[PDB]
């Protein structure tokens, strides 16, 4: 970083790239890339700066440059990972896959009672019931939050937008939240209200959670049992269910010069190269965003030794993004997340809770 400093003082063309990385291995692994690139490019540097907010907020101004207009070729990119940085058909950022929803499970407890890993939503609910009765407590653990909702919503056929408008109270939403509530009422679903699911392990019998791929090593550390990772149960049986994918992006403000744009283009192409993607992913547990990364021997070798990581990557292909609206962080936490809490912990009627949520969301979005 002080190495990025040395490199940008000496340089005459400086391109500013804005990212949403906080700290830890991800920020380190990005800086690493900046350093490597700068060392190949004497006279011009990249400066990686942490952005304050998300891409919908910056795009409401039109504060960002279109990636492809810098001259960046996005062939080899898995296009499904651009869903959230695509606005009116134009790509405004190069994404990173911070996490994928996966099925964490207890291998020893499923074996103990002869229960196959569920491949469908209906086999999952049946497995939850059977193992709950067997162990005398609810074995499907869940945070009552928009992330757990998303999994059930997406795999009962739900979509957040209908003809461009946000709908929190569709029949798919009611059906999802009703499924979770009945899980609690029937003794198979355990709400986790204090700390991460992995911070609650050991308090009683656990069989499964749907939770972020980012929690992998924390699930490993806390599991006093053989930990499994599988793809998400879906409605039909020959493919994984949809999982929430969440993103950190790299973007560039529309002010930058031609010279700066040539540097940013070379940098973003570097970041998208197979070995850059493979080194970043192996260093961080992130999922690469290119098809080329998956054929890079550094990815291939890491995947070969880390079958739980190969499973996280297989899930990544069956990914949905949350809506790309400036207000979405607020709706997800203060409005949708509240209706979910209300239905799950205070026995609110699922329909009446999501109807109140819709009204509050329509109110916030029309201001």
List keywords for this structure.
monomer, 367 residues, Bact_solute-bd_prot1, SBP_1_CS, SBP, transport, Sugar ABC transporter, periplasmic sugar-binding protein
List the helices and strands and how they pair.
Elements: H1 2-10, E1 13-19, H2 24-40, E2 44-50, H3 55-61, E3 86-87, E4 90-91, E5 94-106, H4 107-112, H5 121-135, E6 140-142, H6 146-154, E7 161-162, E8 165-166, H7 171-185, E9 189-191, H8 197-200, E10 208-212, H9 216-222, E11 227-230, E12 243-250, H10 258-272, H11 274-284, H12 297-305, H13 307-316, E13 319-320, H14 328-345, H15 350-366
Helix pairs in contact: 1-2, 2-11, 6-7, 11-12, 12-13, 14-15
Explained architecture:
The protein starts with a helix and ends with a helix. It has helices at 2-10, 24-40, 55-61, 107-112, 121-135, 146-154, 171-185, 197-200, 216-222, 258-272, 274-284, 297-305, 307-316, 328-345, 350-366; strands spanning 13-19, 44-50, 86-87, 90-91, 94-106, 140-142, 161-162, 165-166, 189-191, 208-212, 227-230, 243-250, 319-320. 46% of the residues lie in helices and 16% in strands. Helix 14 (328-345) packs antiparallel against helix 15 (350-366). It contains 15 helices and 13 strands. The protein is of the alpha/beta class and 367 residues long. It holds the Pfam family SBP_bac_8. InterPro entries: Bact_solute-bd_prot1, SBP, SBP_1_CS. Belongs to the bacterial solute-binding protein 1 family.
């Amino acid at each position: 970083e002080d190495v990025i400093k040395e490199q940008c003082a000496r340089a005459k063309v400086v391109a500013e790239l804005w990212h949403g990385f906080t700290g830890g291995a991800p920020k380190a692994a990005l800086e690493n890339l900046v350093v490597e690139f700068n060392k190949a490019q004497q006279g011009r540097c990249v400066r990686a700066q942490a952005a304050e907010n998300n891409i919908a907020l910056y795009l409401e101004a039109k504060a960002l440059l279109p990636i492809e207009s810098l001259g960046v070729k996005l062939q080899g990119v898995n296009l499904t990972f651009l869903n959230a940085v695509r606005f009116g058909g134009v790509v405004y950022g190069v994404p990173f896959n911070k996490s994928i929803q996966v099925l964490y499970y207890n291998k020893d407890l499923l074996k103990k009672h002869g229960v196959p890993v569920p491949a469908t939503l209906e086999e999952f609910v049946a497995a939850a019931k059977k193992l709950s009765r067997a162990e005398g407590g609810p074995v499907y653990w869940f945070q009552p939050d928009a992330s757990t909702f998303a999994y059930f919503f997406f795999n009962l056929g739900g979509s957040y937008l209908k003809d461009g408008k946000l709908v929190l109270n569709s029949k798919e939403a009611v059906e999802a939240l009703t499924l979770l509530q009945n899980g609690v009422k029937e003794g198979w679903a355990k709400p986790i209200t204090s700390g991460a699911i992995n911070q609650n392990l050991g308090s009683g019998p656990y069989a499964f959670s749907v939770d972020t791929s980012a929690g992998y090593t924390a699930y490993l550390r806390a599991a006093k049992f053989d930990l499994g990772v599988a793809t998400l149960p879906g409605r039909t049986k020959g493919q994984p269910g949809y999982g929430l994918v969440q993103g950190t992006n790299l973007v560039v403000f529309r002010q930058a010069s031609k010279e700066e744009q040539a540097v940013a283009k070379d940098f973003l192409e570097f970041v998208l190269s197979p070995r850059a993607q493979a080194v970043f992913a192996t260093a961080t547990g992130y999922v690469p965003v290119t098809e080329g990364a998956l054929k890079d021997p550094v990815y291939q070798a890491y995947a070969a030794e880390n079958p739980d990581y190969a499973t996280i990557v297989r899930q990544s292909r069956y990914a949905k993004f949350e809506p790309a609206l400036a207000e979405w962080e607020q709706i997800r936490f203060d409005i949708l997340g509240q209706a979910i809490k209300e239905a799950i912990l205070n026995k609110a009627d699922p329909k009446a809770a999501l109807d109140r949520a819709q009204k509050l969301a329509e109110d916030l979005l029309s201001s």
